[PDB]
């Protein structure tokens, strides 16, 4: 029951940017100001990317809090007969929807609903001050959404294809086969899926017709010219009529490009303005190649003062795994905290040679990735990460370079989880966990991005028989033979491995994290040695095994389905460690001091290096090999083997899952600031860390266009309403 609501007491923290703001020159501030705005604008697209009803809910909420703030609306709600606790549930839901840019959780892809009675909420709404100034729109919004706002029907409970779940990346009638047929179409046409959606219409015969729609300001109308424009037309692919179009999110992307172009005026150099230029092209024409071009310049731009990025980037929430969720961020580099990470880059080339694969499976060059520590001013999208490795185009990754970011003010925000909130750890591990967790975190973040995602080469063949490796002389360490598998033109990591692609890659990255933290240089660069370093190493591992148990809450047994890719990866690593045996890890079910079912994880530190290391090395080798050669049959067999959740002894993971569910703790919500223009001077606005303050932070987010933005989301939404 507790899975589908947010609890009234859910944590809220405020991201801290003041001193990072103070560092910025008058020009950098205006650059950042126009960039944040673009980010925030596009962030609203994530709504259409969540659920059918999400746009309506956001418009309903923003209209409510425009007319009355949480304290004014409280007066009305309590006159209407709500208890303070019911009203609080409302705030929390509002905050959650704002926080997620939708009514499904970003971490776990699960629906949440208001924790108060429906007929009660309706009173707070229909009788509100907002309903008095515009009764037409308010009553029309509540009619189109409120049912779906509360509906827990099993098919609505999680994101996904088929009738199992909800997805807006696809029309409701789509299934896994549709997505696969589409993926194949996009590949033969050498067209990226990051920015698209799939809509399916059927005639009276029942014959499926597919619209692949690209995101852009320009409709399919009389364009300028492009690599996109030549592709707008009807095709026939394996018996299926295909139409490629554009104009998705058009009026939202228009606001974005307006702000990017304003930003261009304040750009610090030629790389920044050249990338923004290409960004504008990308969002105007719907050209993903124009994004790649922009990303190239952005990689060239090293150690800026204000760092940022925008676009359709992460493919996590596309059920199939090829489609990206819009996001953008604006951040200030921190020179101090960036010192260590540069020491890390200086020694990275060295450290790569510790990884359990030949130089033939490692990238030919090793350019310098430029790792930096940032303080986030704005992160718009489904959620805020700890660290990032970008961009996501692999050709650029190995021919050009990439950037690594640790966001030091996101880390700082969670040092949280007080001792009583530490589940399944013995008293003595609790102490170490509490002491070394933060430092253990800085390390895993660094190794993960730099050496985890930034290592490894893919074997490719272009239009000709030309390989980026040497075919005849390259030996596969597993097969003792030549390389029989590789990527062809149009093929990508995401297209080939699809469903497991995002997670499999994450599993690889966190495994090198665990593997290389054992090295003493890695640890001294972060400033630890002796009886400190060994403690952070330990907790890193203890942290991983624990997280693999907690991962269980994100598995859906009925569907045999993992809902979060980082959690699945951590469960796989937990299982690889268990399978090694020899006493490294034990899960012992127990009884809680509160009487309910509990459990204990035990890690033996003396066996990490003797048992654990050998196990991970073996695992890593198999992972890279299958990725480089892009072997999907093998890759899937290996990964879906370890990812299988069963009741087999001694673990009994299905049964354990129930104890995990019982003891689960809900993820905190984070409040972000607002930048305001006074004229030449720009200022930073801050908010209370509570549901109310997060609501206000959105209330004041769009002072100019808020009412227009709402109607825009509304119409974008009803236009496509026939598809779900």
């Amino acid at each position: 029951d507790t899975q589908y609501i947010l609890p009234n007491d859910i944590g809220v923290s405020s991201l801290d940017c003041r001193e990072a703001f103070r560092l910025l020159s008058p020009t950098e501030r205006l650059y950042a100001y126009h960039l944040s705005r673009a980010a925030w604008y596009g962030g609203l697209a994530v709504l259409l990317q969540t659920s059918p009803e999400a746009p309506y809910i956001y418009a309903l909420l923003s209209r409510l809090f425009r007319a009355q703030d949480p304290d004014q609306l409280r007066q009305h709600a309590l006159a209407e007969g709500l208890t303070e606790e019911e009203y609080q549930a409302f705030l929390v839901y509002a905050a959650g929807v704002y926080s997620n840019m939708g009514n499904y959780k970003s971490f776990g892809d699960t629906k949440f609903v208001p924790n108060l009675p429906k007929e009660k909420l309706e009173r707070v709404i229909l009788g509100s001050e907002a309903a008095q100034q515009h009764p037409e729109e308010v009553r029309g919004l509540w009619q189109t959404c409120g049912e779906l706002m509360f509906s827990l029907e099993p098919r609505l409970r999680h994101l996904g294809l088929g009738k199992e779940g909800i997805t807006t990346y696809f029309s409701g009638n789509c299934t896994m086969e549709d997505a696969k047929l589409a993926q194949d179409f996009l590949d033969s046409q050498n067209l990226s899926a990051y920015n698209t959606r799939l809509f399916k219409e059927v005639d009276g015969e029942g014959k499926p017709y597919y619209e692949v729609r690209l995101a852009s300001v320009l409709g399919s109308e009389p364009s300028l010219d492009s690599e996109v424009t030549s592709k707008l037309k009807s095709y026939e692919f394996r018996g299926s009529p295909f139409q490629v179009t554009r104009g998705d999110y058009a009026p939202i992307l228009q606001k974005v490009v307006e702000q990017l172009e304003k930003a261009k005026a304040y750009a610090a150099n030629s790389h920044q303005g050249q990338m923004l230029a290409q960004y504008i092209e990308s969002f105007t024409q719907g050209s993903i190649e124009a994004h790649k071009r922009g990303s190239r310049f952005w990689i060239q731009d090293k150690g800026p003062i204000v760092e940022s990025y925008i676009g359709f980037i992460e493919s996590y929430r596309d059920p199939f795994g090829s489609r990206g969720e819009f996001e953008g961020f604006v951040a200030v580099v921190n020179k101090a905290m960036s010192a260590k990470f540069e020491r890390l880059v200086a020694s990275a080339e060295q450290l790569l040679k510790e990884l359990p694969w030949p130089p033939t499976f490692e990238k030919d060059k090793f350019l310098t990735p430029d790792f930096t520590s940032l303080d986030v001013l704005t992160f718009a999208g489904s959620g805020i990460p700890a660290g990032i490795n970008i961009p996501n185009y692999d050709d650029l990754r190995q021919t050009e370079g990439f950037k690594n970011v640790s966001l030091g003010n996101v880390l700082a925000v969670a040092y949280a989880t007080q001792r009583e909130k530490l589940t399944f750890l013995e008293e003595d591990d609790k102490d170490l966990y509490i002491l070394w967790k933060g430092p253990s975190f800085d390390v895993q973040v660094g190794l993960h991005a730099l050496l985890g995602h930034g290592s490894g080469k893919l074997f490719v063949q272009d239009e000709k028989g030309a390989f980026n490796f040497d075919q005849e002389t390259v030996i596969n360490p597993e097969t003792g033979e030549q390389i029989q598998s590789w990527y062809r033109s149009g093929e990508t990591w995401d297209s080939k491995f699809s469903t497991i692609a995002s997670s499999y890659e994450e599993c690889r990255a966190e495994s090198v994290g665990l593997y290389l933290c054992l090295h003493p240089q890695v640890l001294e660069i972060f400033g630890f040695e002796g009886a400190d370093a060994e403690d952070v190493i330990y907790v890193n591992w203890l942290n991983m095994v624990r997280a693999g148990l907690l991962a269980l809450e994100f598995y859906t047994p009925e569907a045999f389905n993992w809902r979060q890719a980082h959690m699945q990866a951590r469960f796989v690593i937990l299982r690889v460690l268990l399978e090694a045996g020899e006493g490294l890890v034990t899960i012992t079910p127990t009884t809680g001091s509160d009487g309910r079912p509990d459990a204990r994880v035990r890690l033996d530190r003396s066996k990490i290096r003797s048992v654990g290391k050998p196990a991970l090395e073996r695992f890593l080798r198999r992972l890279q090999v299958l990725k480089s050669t892009g072997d999907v049959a093998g890759g899937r067999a290996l990964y879906e083997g370890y990812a299988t959740v069963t009741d087999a002894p001694p673990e009994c993971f299905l049964t354990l899952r129930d104890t995990v569910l019982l003891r689960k703790e809900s993820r905190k919500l984070i409040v972000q600031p607002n930048t305001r223009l006074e004229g030449s001077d720009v200022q930073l606005l801050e908010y209370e860390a509570s549901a109310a303050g997060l609501i206000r932070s959105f209330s004041e987010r769009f002072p100019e266009d808020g009412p227009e933005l709402e109607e825009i989301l509304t119409q974008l939404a009803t236009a496509d309403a026939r598809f779900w």
Binding site: P385, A386, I388, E506
Partner: peptide, 5 residues
């Protein structure tokens, strides 16, 4: 690619 907190 992301690392979550």
């Amino acid at each position: 690619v992301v690392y979550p907190w």
